[PDB]
Design a protein around this ligand. Structure first.
Ligand SMILES: Nc1cc(C(F)(F)F)c(S(N)(=O)=O)cc1S(N)(=O)=O
Ligand SMILES: [Zn+2]
Length: 257
C-alpha cells in the first residue's frame, strides 16, 4: 500500500497513480514574488459557526476529523470559488522535526505542519462525485509554526492517545474548527490536486498566508501517533507530507498586495 516510506513513498506513487506526474499536481512551492495580486477575486467566506464534528480517525497515514456534511452547515464560499463548498473533514501533515512537515512551501520555506480543511462542491451531490470534477473540491490550507500553543487545537491533541494506531477512531463531537483559523484570511490560490493518492486533480487550493502558532508540546503529541496498526512494531507517524511538485502551466494568484 502507498505510504511515506522509502519503498512506498511519494517517489513511488506514480506507478499505481500515473496522474502523480500530471499537469496540476499539489503541493507546490509558492514563490511570493511571482504570485500576482488578483482583483477579480471576491472576498473569502468561511462559515463554520454551524459545523458539526462527528469523530476522529487514524487512517494509517494521518488522522481525519470528520464532519456531518449532510446539510449546508460549515461552508466555504467566495474568493476564487463559484458556488458553495461543504466542509467534510480536516487533517494535518507534519514532520519529524520543526524544520519540515508542510506540503506547500513559501519561497522554499517549510513549516512544521500544514492543516487541510477539505470541502466539496455541493452542485455535485456527494464527495465521491465531486472528486471526479476539475472544480469538485476546495481545500483551505493553513501553515503551522512552533511557538505559542493554539488553544483551539488542544482538544484534538488530547484525543490522539485514544487513536494511536491505524484503524482506531474516537467520538469527536462539538469541535469548533473556527479555533484553528489565523486572524487574517489573506491567501494564495491555484488549481491543483489531492496531495495523497489517488492524487485526483479536482482541487482549488486556497492557502492562507498567515500561519497559526502551536506549541512544541502540541506538535510532539502529533509525533507520538503510529502509522502501524495495534499490536504491530511501532513506526512513528511523522513526515507524512508530499514534497513540492512542478508548477507547470499554472499561475498562483494572491488575494492581497
Ligand atoms: N483533498 C484531500 C482529500 C482527501 C480524501 F481522501 F479525503 F479524499 C485526503 S486524505 N487521503 O488525506 O483523506 C487528503 C486531501 S489533501 N491532502 O489534498 O488535502
Ligand atoms: Zn492534506
Amino acid at each position: 500500500h502507498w505510504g511515506y516510506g522509502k519503498h512506498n513513498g511519494p517517489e513511488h506513487w506514480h506507478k499505481d497513480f500515473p496522474i502523480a506526474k500530471g499537469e496540476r499536481q499539489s503541493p507546490v512551492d509558492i514563490d511570493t514574488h511571482t504570485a500576482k495580486y488578483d482583483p477579480s477575486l471576491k472576498p473569502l467566506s468561511v462559515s463554520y459557526d454551524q459545523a458539526t464534528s462527528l469523530r476522529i480517525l487514524n487512517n494509517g497515514h494521518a488522522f481525519n476529523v470528520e464532519f456531518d456534511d449532510s446539510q449546508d452547515k460549515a461552508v466555504l464560499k467566495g474568493g476564487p470559488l463559484d458556488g458553495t463548498y461543504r466542509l467534510i473533514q480536516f487533517h494535518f501533515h507534519w514532520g519529524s522535526l520543526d524544520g519540515q512537515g508542510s506540503e506547500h512551501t513559501v519561497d522554499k520555506k517549510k513549516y512544521a505542519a500544514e492543516l487541510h480543511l477539505v470541502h466539496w462542491n455541493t452542485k455535485y451531490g456527494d464527495f465521491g462525485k465531486a472528486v471526479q470534477q476539475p472544480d469538485g473540491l476546495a481545500v483551505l490550507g493553513i501553515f503551522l509554526k512552533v511557538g505559542s500553543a493554539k488553544p483551539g487545537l488542544q482538544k484534538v491533541v488530547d484525543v490522539l492517545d485514544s487513536i494511536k494506531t491505524k484503524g482506531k477512531s474516537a467520538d469527536f463531537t462539538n469541535f469548533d474548527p473556527r479555533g484553528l483559523l489565523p486572524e487574517s484570511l489573506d491567501y494564495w490560490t491555484y488549481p491543483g490536486s489531492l496531495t495523497t493518492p489517488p492524487l485526483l486533480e479536482c482541487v482549488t487550493w486556497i492557502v492562507l498566508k498567515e500561519p497559526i502558532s502551536v506549541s512544541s508540546e502540541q506538535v510532539l503529541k502529533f509525533r507520538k501517533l503510529n502509522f502501524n496498526g495495534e499490536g504491530e512494531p511501532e513506526e512513528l507517524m511523522v513526515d507524512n507530507w508530499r514534497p513540492a511538485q512542478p508548477l507547470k502551466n499554472r499561475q498562483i494568484k494572491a488575494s492581497f498586495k
